[PDB]
Design a protein around this ligand. Structure first.
Ligand code: TAC
Ligand code: TAC
Ligand code: MG
Ligand code: MG
Lengths: 198, 198
């Protein structure tokens, strides 16, 4: 196998799709590349080093709306960005468990700094723009995770019966797209009121 | 050790606190109870059977505001309920990874049916009350998970520096409590407008 960073991430996403994250061992990655474990360890010191790099890499390969277009509102950027993120995260089995607990990589600094400067520049203070970006990030994570884990880890009172039917009727994209509009409108109400009691 | 359902869940939460979920093996549970694996298997057929039961059990032991008080608004019930849920989930290491992908247990049917009937009874249709309850559930899950995984998996442009400082300054309860008010206000705006374009 060729063994630079790029060929290791590829084999490691490929493997994450067959085994998920808890089956993603440096031993199955060595066996997948057809090499021996001291070879692998020359390159990949460990699983955290690896999970972190994969976190960076799924976004960089599949998360396109990371930057606001010229003339775009903060509400359209937060919508277009969340959807794009939900979808980078669903491209790979356990894509959202991989992201959990990370923090921006140095390779992403210019992108996420632009994002926080665009919010201040639209009237958010740093703390509130930060909180808006986090609630969007945390709601897309918990939504994709409840979807990915339910698919995989496979007498009703009348309403629960009907709700389960609705829940299951699609991938959870409708429930997501609708909670995203409520999140975005609640932030508008906050932004606009500020010192007026609301 | 005594080996009924109740003593198994106890030993299994105890063990989840030392090892987390990926260290929660039926072998370390057998060793923790001081018994042999065929003994254990008479009781606990497997890890899913076990994770599912723990999911039920943390809520039943630590999630108190599962039911609306008499005369409470749907906005105060959604607030009081989300906070209570965030906290059942944080009581145990990897408490929120345990919950992921589950669905209500038969032992919870009366509680979650009441919850969906209270929303319809406050003007939500079943589909929208469902979506409101889910967005609250998915935002508390992704928030607790990003917190629990970051604590555990342990050149800045100016704004990111300051945001990281803010992010870390508390457990993430302030960011959570604030995204929860934006979620709840966006649903009010939806509820009230209905057929009026909004
Ligand atoms: C909201 N949207 C999905 C985000 C985004 O699209 C990012 C991106 N690279 O495109 C993030 O990395 C993004 O997805 C993301 O994960 C972000 C973060 O994790 C954090 C953390 O943990 C702490 C401080 C600041 C941030 C952040 C502002 O960079 C976050 C931006 C998140
Ligand atoms: C929003 N609040 C945190 C909830 C709640 O407090 C529950 C509870 N037992 O107290 C749930 O089980 C609750 O936490 C929860 O997990 C619920 C569900 O998972 C679902 C699922 O997956 C599908 C259909 C219906 C539901 C639900 C209506 O029962 C959910 C209610 C969630
Ligand atoms: Mg992140
Ligand atoms: Mg649930």
């Amino acid at each position: 196998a060729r063994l630079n960073r790029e060929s290791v991430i590829d084999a490691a996403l490929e493997l994450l799709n067959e085994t998920g994250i808890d089956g993603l061992t440096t031993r199955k990655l060595a066996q997948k590349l057809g090499i021996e474990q001291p070879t692998l360890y020359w390159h990949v010191k460990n699983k955290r080093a690896l999970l972190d790099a994969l976190a960076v890499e799924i976004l960089a390969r599949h998360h396109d709306y990371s930057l606001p277009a010229a003339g775009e509102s903060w509400q359209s950027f937060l919508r277009n960005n969340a959807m794009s993120f939900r979808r980078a995260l669903l491209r790979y089995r356990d894509g959202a468990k991989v992201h959990l607990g990370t923090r921006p990589d140095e390779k992403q600094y210019d992108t996420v700094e632009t994002q926080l400067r665009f919010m201040t520049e639209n009237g958010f203070s740093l703390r509130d723009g930060l909180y808006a970006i986090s609630a969007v990030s945390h709601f897309t994570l918990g939504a994709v995770l409840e979807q990915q884990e339910h698919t995989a880890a496979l007498n009703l009172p009348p309403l629960l019966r009907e709700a389960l039917q609705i829940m299951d009727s699609d991938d959870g994209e409708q429930a997501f797209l609708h909670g995203l509009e409520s999140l975005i409108r609640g932030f508008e109400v906050q932004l606009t009121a500020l010192l007026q009691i609301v």
